[PDB]
Design a protein around this ligand. Structure first.
Ligand code: MG
Ligand code: MG
Ligand code: MG
Ligand code: MG
Ligand code: MG
Lengths: 280, 280
């Protein structure tokens, strides 16, 4: 089941990340603690799940993707630490608990995020977290840097900033989302597939399509749930499309993701289950 | 001369970095502009100079180290963008011109720094900026991530934060400096040496020793110059050692750096000139 697969994914990446967060000296203890706080918050580890699942879909042992899984989670975690800062989203809480700058301070949170990004690259190339060839590994870091950087995730965040008080159309909203969250979701599946040592051109293309579709499905579904909650109590896909059409679109995106996985056997079931889960 | 070598180093890295800073879309233009602003400020490019000089000391063509040079400058630049933020150093000016958060805003500066770090890794592995083997290149990214991250430069910044209002001894001050600036100086020489494709174990060790010595020499000399300026107008090495002893120490560090380069021929002259320059 997806519940079982999420639990195994979470346990595996959490255990793998453990070693990364021991300070080499007492002087550095607080920094490493702030990084741990930013990561070890009981997160659902969807990005590790995607990396492990992509690896297994191609016949790899999941631990082959430990470096991939750690890297994408560390990039994700750093992005949230910075996003929560007063200069950005200005959030005092995340999932009910104080954000890193509140539990520590702003300077510490800035540095914790900066350190987490560097650690993500270290994890990708750590021989204990994988065994892929130098060349496969080359591809991995190239992909992560492109996905995480100013043409990917950071670019998405900058688009989000630059769109405050603009009336975006569907194309613009999707473009933003594809950067802000799609890029790192795609990196998760591509890195895990690469980690198997068995990935062919066609399969990577298929996984890219899958990843982009679930990336958008998450965003569309989030908007639908917001409207349904507001209806219950009182630029979005429902505003642009109408709620009925937005609902149809979320199902369409799920179906696009499932269709992209047609070249894979039963070993891809966790990826199929995740796509279904998004709209359940 | 060192003037000539600095000029060539600056020109080469600036030209190499140029391509990196064109936005792939109008939506991303402001982010790329903020990154350019943070880098293209007329900086002296000491870290690129070190990378090129280390490469040439081992018989490489300097352009072999373009990826190394760009990477270390991009990491340096990102570190300053974050350091200038109100939550950190709170500086409105850098080298006489408005800092990135002042010319743009804080959110943009946070993201520009985040994007610059990702770009540093991209530059390291860009086939247009070097031609080293996948394996040499593996070593390069490993080294950069260790130097830049929470056990290196970011660690140094965290030590600096955690030392506010402490009376540090010489050992503690040096430990901080070795992290805050020494790590990236060492990465500059090691990455450039690796880029030559000709680096042997003993030569890398020698360059590490050179790098640590000039890293400290810069810090000691800075403190001496601060005291001499204060004397002229009105935890530091002069306070801990006495000014006379601090002066002797700066010369000692220069001599340690020069001694470390004894295994190299005339091709290492720019590294020797830089060591002499620090105390002139
Ligand atoms: Mg928020
Ligand atoms: Mg090979
Ligand atoms: Mg939304
Ligand atoms: Mg300052
Ligand atoms: Mg000083």
């Amino acid at each position: 089941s997806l519940t079982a697969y999420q639990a195994s994914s979470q346990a595996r990446v959490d255990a793998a990340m453990h070693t990364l967060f021991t300070a080499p000296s007492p002087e550095l203890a607080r920094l490493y603690e702030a990084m741990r706080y930013s990561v070890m918050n009981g997160g659902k580890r969807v990005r590790p799940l995607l990396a492990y699942a992509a690896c297994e879909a191609l016949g790899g042992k999941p631990e082959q993707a430990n470096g991939a899984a750690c890297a994408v989670e560390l990039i994700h975690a750093y992005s949230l630490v910075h996003d929560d800062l007063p200069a950005m989203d200005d959030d005092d809480l995340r999932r009910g608990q104080p954000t890193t700058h509140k539990a520590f301070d702003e300077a510490c949170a800035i540095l914790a995020g900066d350190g987490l990004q560097s650690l993500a690259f270290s994890a990708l190339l750590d021989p204990a977290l994988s065994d892929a060839s130098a060349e496969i590994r080359l591809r991995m870091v190239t992909t992560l840097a492109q996905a995480a950087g100013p043409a990917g995730m950071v670019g998405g965040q900058a688009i989000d900033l630059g769109s405050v008080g603009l009336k975006l159309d569907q194309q613009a909203l999707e473009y933003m989302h594809r950067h802000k969250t799609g890029a790192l979701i795609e990196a998760s599946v591509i890195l895990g597939a690469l980690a198997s040592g068995r990935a062919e051109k066609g399969e990577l293309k298929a996984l890219q399509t899958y990843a982009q579709a679930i990336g958008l499905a998450f965003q569309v579904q989030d908007d639908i749930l917001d409207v349904e909650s507001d209806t219950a109590t009182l630029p979005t896909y429902p505003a642009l499309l109408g709620l009925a059409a937005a609902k149809e679109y979320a199902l369409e995106l799920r179906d696009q993701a499932l269709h992209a996985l047609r070249p894979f056997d039963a070993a891809a079931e966790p990826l199929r289950e995740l796509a279904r889960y998004i709209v359940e």
